[PDB]
């Protein structure tokens, strides 16, 4: 929840789900994974 589509994601940043909707975002420019942050 708390994650509308008012804005897309950041460049060089893939995404992936590791659980029940755990769409953790894959930072490409830095090669890393982080929960919600860029979207919301």
């Amino acid at each position: 929840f708390e994650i509308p589509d008012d804005v897309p994601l950041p460049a060089g940043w893939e995404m992936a789900k590791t659980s029940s909707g755990q769409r953790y975002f894959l930072n490409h420019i830095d090669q890393t994974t982080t929960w919600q942050d860029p979207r919301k």
Binding site: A16, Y24, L26, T34
Partner: peptide, 5 residues
């Protein structure tokens, strides 16, 4: 615990 890539 951050997930892998």
């Amino acid at each position: 615990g951050p997930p892998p890539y």
